[PDB]
Each structure stands twice: as structure tokens, then as C-alpha cells.
Design a protein around this motif. Structure first.
Motif, PDB file in Angstrom:
ATOM      1  N   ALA A  35      -3.449  -0.966  12.699  1.00 42.00           N
ATOM      2  CA  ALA A  35      -3.191  -0.477  13.755  1.00 42.00           C
ATOM      3  C   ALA A  35      -3.262  -0.351  15.331  1.00 42.00           C
ATOM      4  O   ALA A  35      -2.592  -0.042  15.961  1.00 42.00           O
ATOM      5  CB  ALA A  35      -2.271   1.258  13.247  1.00 42.00           C
ATOM      6  N   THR A  45      -1.298  10.357   6.371  1.00 42.00           N
ATOM      7  CA  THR A  45      -1.803  10.883   6.543  1.00 42.00           C
ATOM      8  C   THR A  45      -2.506  10.801   7.451  1.00 42.00           C
ATOM      9  O   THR A  45      -2.944   9.545   8.260  1.00 42.00           O
ATOM     10  CB  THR A  45      -2.622  11.597   5.291  1.00 42.00           C
ATOM     11  N   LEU A  64      -2.756  -3.914   6.902  1.00 40.33           N
ATOM     12  CA  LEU A  64      -2.253  -4.132   8.447  1.00 40.33           C
ATOM     13  C   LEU A  64      -3.183  -3.165   8.972  1.00 40.33           C
ATOM     14  O   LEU A  64      -3.398  -2.272   8.939  1.00 40.33           O
ATOM     15  CB  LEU A  64      -1.390  -3.492   8.999  1.00 40.33           C
ATOM     16  N   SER A 105      -5.428   3.208  10.937  1.00 37.80           N
ATOM     17  CA  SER A 105      -6.442   4.290  11.773  1.00 37.80           C
ATOM     18  C   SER A 105      -7.675   4.142  11.473  1.00 37.80           C
ATOM     19  O   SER A 105      -7.889   4.439  10.239  1.00 37.80           O
ATOM     20  CB  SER A 105      -5.234   4.357  12.787  1.00 37.80           C
ATOM     21  N   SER A 127      -6.044   7.829  10.635  1.00 37.99           N
ATOM     22  CA  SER A 127      -5.029   8.141   9.889  1.00 37.99           C
ATOM     23  C   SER A 127      -4.808   6.747   8.902  1.00 37.99           C
ATOM     24  O   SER A 127      -5.160   5.929   9.312  1.00 37.99           O
ATOM     25  CB  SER A 127      -3.875   7.899  11.086  1.00 37.99           C
ATOM     26  N   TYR A 128      -3.515   7.226   7.822  1.00 38.06           N
ATOM     27  CA  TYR A 128      -3.500   5.951   7.602  1.00 38.06           C
ATOM     28  C   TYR A 128      -2.243   6.100   6.571  1.00 38.06           C
ATOM     29  O   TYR A 128      -1.485   7.408   6.627  1.00 38.06           O
ATOM     30  CB  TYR A 128      -3.678   4.580   6.164  1.00 38.06           C
ATOM     31  N   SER A 129      -0.562   4.569   6.676  1.00 34.67           N
ATOM     32  CA  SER A 129       0.768   5.384   5.856  1.00 34.67           C
ATOM     33  C   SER A 129       0.180   4.756   5.045  1.00 34.67           C
ATOM     34  O   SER A 129      -0.194   3.360   4.921  1.00 34.67           O
ATOM     35  CB  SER A 129       1.824   5.263   6.955  1.00 34.67           C
ATOM     36  N   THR A 130       0.900   4.374   4.044  1.00 35.92           N
ATOM     37  CA  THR A 130       1.231   3.498   3.178  1.00 35.92           C
ATOM     38  C   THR A 130       2.597   4.081   2.324  1.00 35.92           C
ATOM     39  O   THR A 130       3.922   4.749   2.768  1.00 35.92           O
ATOM     40  CB  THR A 130       0.322   4.313   1.644  1.00 35.92           C
ATOM     41  N   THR A 131       3.181   2.785   2.243  1.00 33.25           N
ATOM     42  CA  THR A 131       4.977   2.580   1.359  1.00 33.25           C
ATOM     43  C   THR A 131       4.748   2.037   0.456  1.00 33.25           C
ATOM     44  O   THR A 131       4.034   0.936   0.430  1.00 33.25           O
ATOM     45  CB  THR A 131       5.466   2.245   2.250  1.00 33.25           C
ATOM     46  N   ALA A 132       5.879   2.157  -0.206  1.00 32.95           N
ATOM     47  CA  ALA A 132       6.085   1.227  -1.556  1.00 32.95           C
ATOM     48  C   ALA A 132       7.371   0.115  -1.288  1.00 32.95           C
ATOM     49  O   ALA A 132       8.293   0.612  -0.648  1.00 32.95           O
ATOM     50  CB  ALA A 132       6.045   1.917  -2.570  1.00 32.95           C
ATOM     51  N   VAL A 139      -3.760   4.872  -3.471  1.00 34.44           N
ATOM     52  CA  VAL A 139      -2.660   5.145  -3.652  1.00 34.44           C
ATOM     53  C   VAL A 139      -2.726   5.065  -4.845  1.00 34.44           C
ATOM     54  O   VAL A 139      -2.858   4.219  -5.836  1.00 34.44           O
ATOM     55  CB  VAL A 139      -2.000   4.514  -3.260  1.00 34.44           C
ATOM     56  N   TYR A 197       4.075   8.042   2.352  1.00 39.38           N
ATOM     57  CA  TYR A 197       3.599   9.289   3.112  1.00 39.38           C
ATOM     58  C   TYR A 197       2.636   8.615   4.277  1.00 39.38           C
ATOM     59  O   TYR A 197       1.792   7.481   4.103  1.00 39.38           O
ATOM     60  CB  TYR A 197       2.439  10.107   2.275  1.00 39.38           C
ATOM     61  N   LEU A 251      -1.219   1.048   6.364  1.00 38.46           N
ATOM     62  CA  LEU A 251      -1.733   0.675   7.764  1.00 38.46           C
ATOM     63  C   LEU A 251      -2.322   1.811   7.962  1.00 38.46           C
ATOM     64  O   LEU A 251      -2.179   3.005   7.556  1.00 38.46           O
ATOM     65  CB  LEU A 251       0.145   1.278   8.350  1.00 38.46           C
TER      66      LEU A 251
END
Ligand SMILES: CCc1oc2ccccc2c1C(=O)c1cc(Br)c(O)c(Br)c1
Ligand SMILES: CCc1oc2ccccc2c1C(=O)c1cc(Br)c(O)c(Br)c1
Lengths: 115, 115, 115, 115
Positions: free
Chosen positions: D10, A109, D8, D103, D106-111, D84, A107, D101
Motif C-alpha cells: 500500500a 489492524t 500487495l 503498510s 497496518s495490514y488488512s487481510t481477506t479471504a 492469518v 479484518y 495488503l
């Protein structure tokens, strides 16, 4: 009004509808106390969580119940929920949109802060 | 070595395997000329696209064939492909990783530039 | 109305204002012909690009001029622009929101397709 | 080995180096007990958090100290940290990479779950 939550579904390309959202505020005893909750509409938006009067300075946690969203769609997702933790109104009142974009294993955000 | 592409799948939580990737370099007459291509490995990575000698300053386009990836999984996608367009400059760091995270109706891309 | 573009800034937590957007439609001779263009408003939104009558079936490219956005803010970004390529209206008219979230070395895009 | 974290940046297009990461495991009484922690390397990675013997099924929380990362860069951030929360299950693949990732707003996370 001062706090809005918007949730999108990256698998369907649609608003994420009927997503449960719980907001907590950190208390003096450094515990998470319930502040507001609701569910996203057909537009993926949740308005009316709080008022200018009640949304004081503090550290807030917006918990978006992504696991129950995906499970209702027959998908086993990775995350239990998405948690967004931030200090609000420390420089005076602002309007906050907390947005989340959901996939089963990922996800994102972002915050849009105006005024 | 100077240019690597990595592709991840946000629905399955996995590397995106066997994704076709095409790299183009902008020509003098504003046409995209083919530069390098390949398919991502089992780790979701594409190495060996180019060499330091060949990877000169210029405008490059990395096209990731996301539509065929989702179709092979029986999943209905939105985009025709994901396109990443950037200038390579010699004074910045000289290893470029172009990464992409794929969902059916969304993708994200970032550049990791090191050394 | 049938096609809207929304752009957010992940560094400032704000709408991305005055971002140039160019839309192209793939022609019979397999070339990109100009279809519509505009700039995002103070809300980060671009409405009125086209009409139901003019927005026929086709392959469309939405080019978001991220480099000129960042350069106007005194930042040298990685990408030349963000390009979103998709087939539209192949199953009858739909309403499309193309959204993009921008950082200097990264962007994300999603589509919200309704009706 | 069974659990890796990668972070990371961005804004800079780089690994996020020296980011503090705390891992917790949910206890019987719904309390988060400390499980493992470290700081990301020059590659943005944190290896060696745990072993196969110690990483049993359960609910885990990975907290990434994004606020201190942005403050060290002189950049004004939104979030207190990135969190997470996920269940680890033994029948799914048994290597977990939690990626984020970042900013400022904002951030994004994935598995990425493999093998
Ligand atoms: C396993 C995750 C991962 O592995 C890498 C190896 C080399 C360089 C970067 C990465 C990387 C991250 O880029 C990442 C995280 C997210 Br969230 C994204 O949306 C995108 Br795109 C990329
Ligand atoms: C104010 C935030 C917002 O406004 C919208 C208006 C129409 C459709 C989607 C959205 C939307 C998203 O949730 C969103 C969230 C993230 Br995170 C993104 O990376 C992208 Br891109 C879009």
C-alpha cells in the motif's frame, strides 16, 4: 494505559462489544506466555490490560477472538481470530493502541504508537 | 488494459459480482465528464474500460455503486457509493488496477500500478 | 458532536495531524453545497463541524484532503483525496464518526454510527 | 490450486514481491506443524503451495514475513509478521485465496473463496 485495544464492526458500523482479547509475551524459552486479557467495552475499547511497570520490552502477541464475536451474532466467519505480533518498548516506553476492524471474511489492524 | 477495476466482498469472502462502475475524467471547466463504465464480472473484475490511446494523463474518478450491491443482497449499507479520485501520470507505470474491498459500513481501496 | 472525523496514518502509526476536511451537502438542485470544514487536531480528530440543529437529513460528502497531507510529508500519493458519501439522519438523528486510515497508495474508511 | 496467497504493498502501490510465506496446519497436540511455504512472485502471488489431495479440512495458519519485506525497502515496520488463522471446510467453496495488503504500521487481510 500503555496498551489499549480497540475493535470496530464493519458490518454494523459500531464498536465491537464484548470481544475477548488475549495478550501473550514471548518468553526466554521462545514460548508464548500469558500476559494479560480482557473484553472490549460498549465503546469497543479495552483499557487496563497492563501497567508501565509490567509492560517491559519484548515481543507481544495480541489475539482478538473474532470467531466467538461473530458466532455470538449468528454468523460463521472465516478466521479463527486476529493475531497482532509486534516488538514493544524496544526504544523506551511507548503507548500502543492496537485497533482492529472486523468483517466476517476480512479484518484490518493498525497500530497507533505515541510518546 | 491500461485501467482495470476489481471489487471484493468482505462479508461473503467473494468477488463482488455485477457491481456497476462509472469512470469520469475531469474536464477543463471542473466538471466530471463520463469516460467509461461497466459491471464487474463473476471474478469481480471489469476489463476493457478504455484503451491506451484514450487513457491520457488527467484526473479520473472511479465511482463504485456499492449501495445497489448491498441492497441486492438484502444488506443495509452506509455509503451511497465508493469514489476513487486520482491523477494518471505517464512517467509512472502504465497499468492501473483500482481495487476495492467492500463491507456494509466500510470500504478500502488501493491502487496497483505495474509496468 | 453529531459528526466527527478521525484520520490515522498507516505509514507512521500515528494520528494524521492537520488534515484538511471539507463537508458538502447535496442541495435541491442536485449540487454539492458547502456545509462545514476543518482540520484534524494532534489526535487526528476533527470535532465541532456542525450542530444537531444544522445537521439535518440529507446526502453528505466528507472530502478528506489526503494528497495535501502526503505532499506536506514529502510523498507523492496516488489519490487526490478520499471521499465519503452517505445519507445521514434519515431514521432520525444519529452520531456519526467517519474514520479514515491512510497510506500513499491506499486508504480505508469506516463509519461508526451510534444512538 | 486450492490455496493461493496474494500480497500487495500500500506504500508503493505494487505487488509485494519476494515476501516469504509459511503455512502451518494445527496438529492433534495443538502444535503448528509446517505445511507449505514459498516466496511471492513478481505479481505478488504464491501458487503451488499444496494440492487438493493434501489440503484437507483443518485449522491452518498463514504467516507472511512482513518485517523482512519492509526492512529490505529501508522502511521501519511495526509488526513481526502478519498471521492469518482459519479453518478450511469442505462444504464451502474449494478455492481459497488469502490476500494481504501491507503498510508499515497496518495490514488488512481477506479471504476470497470461490467455486
Ligand atoms: C483477491 C484479492 C486481490 O486480488 C487482486 C487482483 C489484482 C489486484 C489486486 C488484488 C487483490 C488485493 O488488491 C486486495 C486485498 C485487500 Br485486504 C484489499 O482490501 C483490497 Br481493496 C485489495
Ligand atoms: C485508534 C483507531 C481508531 O480510532 C477510532 C475512533 C473512533 C472510531 C473508530 C476508531 C478506530 C478504528 O478501530 C479503525 C481501525 C482501522 Br484498521 C481502520 O482502518 C479505521 Br478507518 C479505523
Amino acid at each position: 494505559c500503555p496498551l489499549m485495544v480497540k475493535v470496530l464492526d464493519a458490518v454494523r458500523g459500531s464498536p465491537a462489544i464484548n470481544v475477548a482479547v488475549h495478550v501473550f509475551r514471548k518468553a526466554a524459552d521462545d514460548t508464548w506466555e500469558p500476559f494479560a486479557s480482557g473484553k472490549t467495552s460498549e465503546s469497543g475499547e479495552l483499557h487496563g490490560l497492563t501497567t508501565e511497570e509490567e509492560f517491559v520490552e519484548g515481543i507481544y502477541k495480541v489475539e482478538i477472538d473474532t470467531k466467538s464475536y461473530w458466532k455470538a451474532l449468528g454468523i460463521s466467519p472465516f478466521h479463527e481470530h486476529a493475531e497482532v505480533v509486534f516488538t514493544a518498548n524496544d526504544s523506551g516506553p511507548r503507548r500502543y493502541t492496537i485497533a482492529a476492524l472486523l468483517s466476517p471474511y476480512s479484518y484490518s489492524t493498525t497500530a497507533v504508537v505515541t510518546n
